[PDB]
Write a protein that binds this DNA or RNA. Structure first.
Ligand SMILES: [Mg+2]
Ligand SMILES: [Mg+2]
Ligand SMILES: [Mg+2]
Ligand SMILES: [Mg+2]
Ligand SMILES: [Mg+2]
Ligand SMILES: [Mg+2]
Ligand SMILES: [Mg+2]
Ligand SMILES: [Mg+2]
Ligand SMILES: [Mg+2]
Ligand SMILES: [Mg+2]
Ligand SMILES: [Mg+2]
Ligand SMILES: [Mg+2]
Ligand SMILES: [Mg+2]
Ligand SMILES: [Mg+2]
Ligand SMILES: [Mg+2]
Ligand SMILES: [Mg+2]
Ligand SMILES: [Mg+2]
Ligand SMILES: [Mg+2]
Ligand SMILES: [Mg+2]
Ligand SMILES: [Mg+2]
Ligand SMILES: [Mg+2]
Ligand SMILES: [Mg+2]
Ligand SMILES: [Mg+2]
Ligand SMILES: [Mg+2]
Ligand SMILES: [Mg+2]
Ligand SMILES: [Mg+2]
Ligand SMILES: [Mg+2]
Ligand SMILES: [Mg+2]
Ligand SMILES: [Mg+2]
Ligand SMILES: [Mg+2]
Ligand SMILES: [Mg+2]
Ligand SMILES: [Mg+2]
Ligand SMILES: [Mg+2]
Ligand SMILES: [Mg+2]
Ligand SMILES: [Mg+2]
Ligand SMILES: [Mg+2]
Ligand SMILES: [Mg+2]
Ligand SMILES: [Mg+2]
Ligand SMILES: [Mg+2]
Ligand SMILES: [Mg+2]
Ligand SMILES: [Mg+2]
Ligand SMILES: [Mg+2]
Ligand SMILES: [Mg+2]
Ligand SMILES: [Mg+2]
Ligand SMILES: [Mg+2]
Ligand SMILES: [Mg+2]
Ligand SMILES: [Mg+2]
Ligand SMILES: [Mg+2]
Ligand SMILES: [Mg+2]
Ligand SMILES: [Mg+2]
Ligand SMILES: [Mg+2]
Ligand SMILES: [Mg+2]
Ligand SMILES: [Mg+2]
Ligand SMILES: [Mg+2]
Ligand SMILES: [Mg+2]
Ligand SMILES: [Mg+2]
Ligand SMILES: [Mg+2]
Lengths: 150, 128, 138
RNA sequence: UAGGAUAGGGGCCUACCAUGGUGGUGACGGGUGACGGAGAAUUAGGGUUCGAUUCCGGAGAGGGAGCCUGAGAAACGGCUACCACAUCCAAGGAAGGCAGCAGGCGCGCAAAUUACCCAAUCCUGACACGGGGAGGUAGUGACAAUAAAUAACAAUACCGGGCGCAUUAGUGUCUGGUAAUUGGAAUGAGUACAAUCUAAAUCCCUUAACGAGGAUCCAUUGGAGGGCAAGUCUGGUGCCAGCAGCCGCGGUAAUUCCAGCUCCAAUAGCGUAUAUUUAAGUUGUUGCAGUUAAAAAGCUCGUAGUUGGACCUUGGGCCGGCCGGCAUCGCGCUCCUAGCCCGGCAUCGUUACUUUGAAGAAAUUAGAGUGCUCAAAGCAAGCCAUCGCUCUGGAUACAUUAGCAUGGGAUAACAUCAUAGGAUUCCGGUCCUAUUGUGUUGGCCUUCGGGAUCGGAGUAAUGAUUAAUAGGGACAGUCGGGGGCAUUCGUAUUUCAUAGUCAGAGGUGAAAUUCUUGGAUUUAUGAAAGACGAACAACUGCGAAAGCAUUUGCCAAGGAUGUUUUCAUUAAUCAAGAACGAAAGUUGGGGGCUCGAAGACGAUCAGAUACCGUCCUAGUCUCAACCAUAAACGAUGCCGACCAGGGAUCGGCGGAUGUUGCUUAUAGGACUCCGCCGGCACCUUAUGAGAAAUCAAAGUCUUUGGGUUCCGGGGGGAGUAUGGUCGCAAGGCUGAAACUUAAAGGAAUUGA
RNA sequence: AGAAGUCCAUUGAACCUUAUCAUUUAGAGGAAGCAGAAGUCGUAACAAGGUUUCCGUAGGUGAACCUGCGGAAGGAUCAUUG
RNA sequence: GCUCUGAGGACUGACAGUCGACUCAGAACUGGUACGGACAAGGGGAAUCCGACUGUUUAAUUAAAACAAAGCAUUGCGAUGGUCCUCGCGGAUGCUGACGCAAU
RNA sequence: UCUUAAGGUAGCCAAAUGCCUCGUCAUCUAAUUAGUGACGCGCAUGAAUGAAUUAACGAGAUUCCCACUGUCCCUGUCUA
């Protein structure tokens, strides 16, 4: 179930059987790359870009239409995020918790949640250093992390 | 928390003990399929059918009510073709029926085929 | 449950090593204190009688169980030793050499007798059964 | 790094230089009643325990040390010194080393002769010849091991079952036996010639004459309540003496003691003690346990360790009787094996696993052959005319791990295609090395042979599995008594103040302490203070647990649901280490209504240091910091799968018309029905499990294996002592032993 | 050639002081556990055991114990739409 | 004592040149075993009692275990007040105000 | 059982506090009215008259031990 809770919910997505786009997706694979590229240069992350395509521009799945995953589309263009999206969003959260504590130091529940976040941050960075998505010297520093994000 | 071919074989025994007609095996694999071929050629299961929606994939097996038990030996030992005899006696109901499946570099097969071809290997399970 | 992984041999071997100390038979023969027992790991032992005593039997019974305090030659130990037959305490005197054996149950008290785990088996180099059976006189 | 020394490598040692080497995969240190192995006991398998000792390796010669000679020694049946022990002395000196063979003392539960000989096996020297306390032979020897006597056969029998008459009988069949009944046959234990034996002796094996009536040529050791085989025998004793591994026996009719008789078991053997093996699935890898019997850590995080989803053809077959040898859309070969243009080629990822072989000391284990008379053994021997010799044998196997070599390549590890710095048939240049044209020796170089770099054209299907009813992250609308900060409220209580009235009130089983005309209690209006948060409130919610219920706002967090978003194995569980942890308790402040350990009183009582009643201190409440424990409980760790039926309920979502005191209209909100997901539970039932109570998870267990952590091994002593460590303290964590004891305990039944 | 002697190095027994370690062993007095016995005081527990029992903590008392605070049912309640 | 060896620097144009006062390590030799050679300059250990410590004290017989002290606690006082001085007028604390003053 | 307002609690001890007293036991010694550790019917201990402890410190009182020495056995000699 959950890594850092006892919940065992199975809420998730279910991609269809058909790899190809539905018949009505009448876009061009070059044109959507512009849609992805513009969204990135606007600073949006891959998870939000896919939501945008699916919701306004009517693209069910990028891997169907283009044959490429979004992050690999960005990376070939030199727009891949320097800190991976998921690692960044955790680092944002741990920064948010620390700022809240620095006014509430008898919030012992919020101190508990903090420990869970860096445990999650460090496990993930262990992975990304192994696969060379982070520099082999990159280190999560509690203090100098609010500068990196937001 | 998954280690398959235990999930597959325990599903068949539980289906068999109740007396059901078919069993579904949600994660499948080449190892699991080769085990069912050995069971089937020896006559302990009917045919079975692979499901590809994409994924690990599903398989439905049709049971004929004449498998008594089928088990996995997780912690897969190495098995010279010389101590076949000692694993035979411990794990099988008698010296007449029952088979120990061993994975060997000439493929997955039962301990009887292993002696003829003079290969040892690593134990996967047994049925009888 | 049990650890079963193929590369878990170190965990399994260590665990039996820790847990064997919880078995009294193991710890009795592996802790070293058998050499601090009076016999110091011998089947019999020679001694010299200090006095003839006699000890009461435990509650359900009622008798005078006759013993002798003997002193062990090898280490100076003083123990109480049962003289096991009818009237056989008479054959035992004071300041006499005596051969002490185990009384049974391997250092644990035997029968109704409180605190005696040694039996006298020879006196003056004459078998004590032989004295009770007249075969050899002292 | 350079030396020195050694036979020689090396911090072996020296000078200078650097700062390394080992460690939870346990270094370092301690224990060993510890030389190592070959092996030994036990063994269904897996194991447990032993190994001083005759073979191999090592080490030592009373303890240390230093040496000479010599090819070889740090030699001790060589020396030198010291330490200890001791011998002789004519008193000045001298001579020492049995852990060699025998023997003595001592020590102990615990072990042989101060014997003969180089005949065998071998060794040694100048040697065919000398020597050998090596080694062999004999005395002692119930350590272990083997074979094997202590009678056999007959007829009489008072008799005893069948079987021939079975009736009515009677005897008679295998002799079953009291039978010192009777009769001769058999023979070695013994003793004795000889011969043999032997290095010489003795013993054995042969064998002249003696060698049996059952009292003798006599078999014993433990038992006879049960376990456990065998007495409801007789005399004695009287909870004595005794027996009894355990349970138990013995208090005047003892199946248990002491005896006689009879029987039982084993038998030339048997009992006792102690260590160990089995039994013991009570150490559990195979293969145990943890709701209540002993035992889930209060809870979560986390490093190491352990474990880890699926996916990449060897798939569809030709071929000859398990397999070669092959074609499909099988990356090369010059170089070795290389067929009559051709199989069957080596380096440009590593391993486990399996297959076969090598090479593996013997003795021991297994195992073939072989009639030592059998057997334990041994490695012999067997046929010939058991006649001048013939035929010989002296097999073979197992050997865990590590190392070497061979094929397989299922499974499982570690490493690694996306900056293309990738592969690739050719093309000259940066450049060196030179070979048949240097018959001699060479030595720079033209086409030419490879480094190696390297710019460009070239070719190709030009090169990134999927998206786990794994996990993370994003997003959407929600949900909650989850947390922190501030804040609004509510009665009650206590105190105060004001007013009224007047004899009691309070408390109790009954009272008393106590308050009271200085007006108690009661009644009424207002004020202060501090705690508390009724009813609603539940087989309901939230939280890792502890825990969390008045209002509102702010801050950060979370689960579930929804999703055709995104990453792509990132995970499970966890020694070491870390966060939180009710109540009480501790140190300081703040506050101090109520209640209230301690204390003080009134009752009760044999007493009452208690229950009951009165008064009250710390405390209760809060801020800062400690503490780290609870029946911290579901007495049930966490992750995963499967498995039975039902209605409730909580959160979300989806699907249905019909209804409202709503709603500018519908839509939504309240309610009814259906479905999915996720929660807290409940009910009914086994086809299940369990000792059961019970349990739909305590199920899918002798048909025993999904992963992983913690933990138990009869009851006490004892969570004690001691050492460590944490704390201000109280104490927490770690945590024995001596000794003691046959039960303690769990579930259920009948009674009382 | 070459002795006694002698010089400096090196190996180094051995003896002595201090220290440390480990194993035994004595001790006024204090204080635990066990067992025995035909003892004294009570009545704590097992029934609602006559104040339901028990767990943590704290205080108090001849002794078993009592009391406060929080917890548990292993309770004497599986139960209020009555 | 003597004779040496090495390290640690400056400036000037990984070098060359010149300069440089000071410290520390190491060796051989040497002596009638002397060498912090005069001077200067702790004796040490095991315990008991009192006072915690530093501080102070009976000038000229007592230096302490006495006094003080930090720490702890109690008491009075909200100014028209407390504690105190003054014959009176008046004054000290107070250029203060409870985290303060005053008394133990 | 008489009595008190309460009957000396936790602790401590022959203590700088104990008459008896050179208390009793142990230890230190050859020998200890001294010292230290215990014991406690405490003439006449005891809780801010503060009780019990206590590292560091002291020209504070006391006991012992090693070193040292003309303090002593036992005096002699030298300088101003
Ligand atoms: Mg799941
Ligand atoms: Mg986890
Ligand atoms: Mg046992
Ligand atoms: Mg060298
Ligand atoms: Mg030894
Ligand atoms: Mg020995
Ligand atoms: Mg000797
Ligand atoms: Mg030697
Ligand atoms: Mg020697
Ligand atoms: Mg000798
Ligand atoms: Mg000898
Ligand atoms: Mg007999
Ligand atoms: Mg008997
Ligand atoms: Mg019996
Ligand atoms: Mg019987
Ligand atoms: Mg017996
Ligand atoms: Mg009994
Ligand atoms: Mg009996
Ligand atoms: Mg008898
Ligand atoms: Mg068990
Ligand atoms: Mg239990
Ligand atoms: Mg639990
Ligand atoms: Mg890990
Ligand atoms: Mg290998
Ligand atoms: Mg998933
Ligand atoms: Mg969201
Ligand atoms: Mg009134
Ligand atoms: Mg609710
Ligand atoms: Mg309310
Ligand atoms: Mg009271
Ligand atoms: Mg606990
Ligand atoms: Mg528990
Ligand atoms: Mg499950
Ligand atoms: Mg719902
Ligand atoms: Mg539901
Ligand atoms: Mg046990
Ligand atoms: Mg136990
Ligand atoms: Mg219990
Ligand atoms: Mg019971
Ligand atoms: Mg009672
Ligand atoms: Mg009661
Ligand atoms: Mg009860
Ligand atoms: Mg009380
Ligand atoms: Mg120097
Ligand atoms: Mg002072
Ligand atoms: Mg003066
Ligand atoms: Mg003075
Ligand atoms: Mg003072
Ligand atoms: Mg004034
Ligand atoms: Mg007192
Ligand atoms: Mg006193
Ligand atoms: Mg003195
Ligand atoms: Mg004293
Ligand atoms: Mg007094
Ligand atoms: Mg007084
Ligand atoms: Mg006083
Ligand atoms: Mg002073």
């Amino acid at each position: 179930g959950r890594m850092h809770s006892r919940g065992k919910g199975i809420s998730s997505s279910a991609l269809p059987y058909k790899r190809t786009p539905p018949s009505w997706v009448k876009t061009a694979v070059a044109d959507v790359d512009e849609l992805i590229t513009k969204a990135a240069k606007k600073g949006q992350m891959p998870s939000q870009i896919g939501v945008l395509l699916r919701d306004q521009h009517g693209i069910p799945l990028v891997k169907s239409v283009t044959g490429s995953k979004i992050l690999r589309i960005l990376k070939a263009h030199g727009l891949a995020p320097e800190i991976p999206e998921d690692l960044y969003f955790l680092i944002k959260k741990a920064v948010a918790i620390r700022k809240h504590l620095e006014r509430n130091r008898k919030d012992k529940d919020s101190k508990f949640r903090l420990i869970l976040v860096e445990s999650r941050i460090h496990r993930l960075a262990r992975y990304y250093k192994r696969t060379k998505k982070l520099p082999p010297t990159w280190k999560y520093e509690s203090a100098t992390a609010s500068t990196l994000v937001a | 928390g998954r280690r398959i071919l235990n999930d597959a074989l325990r599903t068949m025994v539980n289906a068999e003990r109740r007396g059901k007609a078919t069993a579904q095996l949600q994660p499948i694999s080449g190892v699991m399929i080769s085990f069912l071929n050995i069971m089937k050629h020896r006559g302990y299961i009917k045919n079975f059918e692979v499901f590809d929606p994409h994924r690990v994939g599903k398989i439905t097996v049709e049971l004929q009510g004449r498998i008594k038990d089928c088990k996995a030996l997780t912690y897969r030992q190495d098995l010279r073709a010389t101590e076949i005899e000692k694993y035979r006696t411990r794990m099988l109901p008698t010296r007449q029926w029952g088979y120990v499946v061993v994975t060997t570099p000439n493929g997955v097969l039962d301990h009887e085929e292993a002696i003829r071809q003079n290969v040892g290997g690593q134990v996967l399970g047994y049925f009888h | 449950g049990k650890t079963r992984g193929m590369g878990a041999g170190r965990k399994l071997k260590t665990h039996r090593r820790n847990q064997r100390w919880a078995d009294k038979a193991y710890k009795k023969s592996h802790l070293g204190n058998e050499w601090k027992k009076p016999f110091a790991g011998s089947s019999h032992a020679k001694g010299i009688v200090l006095e003839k005593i006699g000890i009461e039997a435990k509650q359900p019974n009622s008798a005078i169980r006759k013993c002798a305090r003997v002193q062990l030659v090898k280490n100076g130990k003083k123990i109480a030793a049962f003289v096991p037959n009818d009237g056989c305490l008479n054959f035992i005197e004071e300041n006499d050499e005596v051969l002490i054996a185990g009384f049974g149950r391997k250092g644990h008290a035997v029968g109704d007798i409180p605190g005696v785990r040694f039996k006298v088996v020879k006196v003056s180099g004459v078998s004590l059964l032989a004295l009770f059976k007249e075969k050899k006189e002292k």
